[PDB]
Design a protein around this ligand. Structure first.
Ligand SMILES: CCCCCCSC[C@H](NC(=O)CC[C@H]([NH3+])C(=O)O)C(=O)NCC(=O)O
Ligand SMILES: CCCCCCSC[C@H](NC(=O)CC[C@H]([NH3+])C(=O)O)C(=O)NCC(=O)O
Lengths: 209, 209
């Protein structure tokens, strides 16, 4: 299974942890967006949206990190706890996954990427929105061990990939004890977290330091 | 199943078509965001993220339209006619769902929201990104009957709710023959499309006055 990615990319790291969780080996294919590698004719033929992470499992090309996460869990996952089949349980995991992309990561990106890449002035309004995003997560975690319940799921892996990027960016998690508590839990229990930690650090040294 | 919504909302319309497709009746509860009704104490207790659509199926509160769509298909859907169980086929639908949220609808909002709710001038740069999104969809449809294959899936319902909004917004689909055709097939085969058409027409209440 070919895995086009970059350790610095949160969505890419979510997949790396998920692949570890299901014991799947990934053929790592570094794809430096900063060198336009995602725009090579070869990559465009596999993915016309030219984005990472992109997975190629025996000819089947797939992108959108969370779709890849689900695919791995359902196809190679032997334990139902990662992505439970119960509709209600699965619904909370799916809501959490969409929350991660459309709210948590999105607000992070909106607030930071303009500063990091375009060297533009920080936006106070977006900073407040980013904070509110973390607050929503703090609330979901109230009285729970993990994001979608008491079992570690792919939602936690996606959320961890994002939060680690937050941490490195310098977010102050003090006002959110549930998040802090859950984040520490993931570091200790999340399969392949080492890769997530390594990716966030690489992000810090390459585009933050 | 209490359905907190507004017809003008694309994500809400996506759920209405999906419920029509699964044969589930929704107890409609209009939630006028413009009046802060979503910020009402009681709603907040059901969904701290104060957003629509929000469904409450016999006490189980759930938001994020696409998570709701999947929940409805798996729990009440027959013959998985809208959401195949096959891992690979399901992955495409899921990737299509994430594309709808993070790219097609997201860029729509990015371009229109500031103009609609901040009456700010139109950002030509963001209009271009919005156009490329439709372009990605046009490519995905290359030689395909529907977004993720030959069968209409919840992906098509989500994409059609988003595209119906693009249409009433005056977007020009002439340069995207695959989208125009697909979209036509959706107006004619998507269960509950009439609700999508009506809600979209209502949305113009944000494009007129
Ligand atoms: C530079 C190192 C840090 C990168 C941080 C952003 S992740 C890279 C980016 N990919 C995405 O944003 C993926 C988002 C998608 N919703 C997912 O979950 O996979 C990309 O390929 N962007 C290029 C493109 O889409 O053209
Ligand atoms: C008012 C008519 C036009 C509405 C257009 C936007 S849809 C309403 C908006 N909801 C969303 O954006 C939901 C997005 C979510 N990703 C989903 O798919 O459900 C909301 O509740 N926003 C308020 C909030 O989040 O507080």
């Amino acid at each position: 299974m070919d895995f086009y990615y970059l350790p610095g990319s949160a969505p890419c790291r979510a997949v790396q942890m998920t692949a570890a969780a299901v014991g799947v080996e990934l053929n790592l294919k570094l794809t430096d967006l900063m060198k336009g590698e995602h725009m090579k004719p070869e990559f465009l033929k596999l993915n016309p949206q030219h984005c990472i992470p992109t997975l190629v499992d025996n000819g089947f090309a797939l992108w959108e990190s969370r779709a890849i996460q689900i695919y791995l869990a359902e196809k190679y996952g032997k334990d139902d706890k990662l992505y439970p089949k119960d509709p209600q349980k699965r619904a909370v995991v799916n809501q959490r996954l969409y929350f991660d992309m459309g709210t948590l990561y999105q607000r992070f990106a909106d607030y930071h990427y303009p500063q990091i890449f375009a060297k533009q002035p920080a936006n106070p309004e977006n900073e407040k929105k980013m904070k509110d995003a973390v607050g929503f997560l703090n609330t979901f975690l109230e009285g729970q061990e993990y994001a979608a319940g008491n079992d570690l799921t792919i939602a936690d892996l996606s959320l961890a990939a994002t939060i680690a990027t937050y941490e490195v960016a310098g977010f102050d998690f003090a006002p959110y004890p549930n998040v802090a508590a859950w984040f520490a839990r993931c570091k200790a229990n999340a399969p392949g977290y080492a890769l997530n930690q390594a990716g966030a650090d690489e992000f810090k040294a390459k585009f933050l330091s």
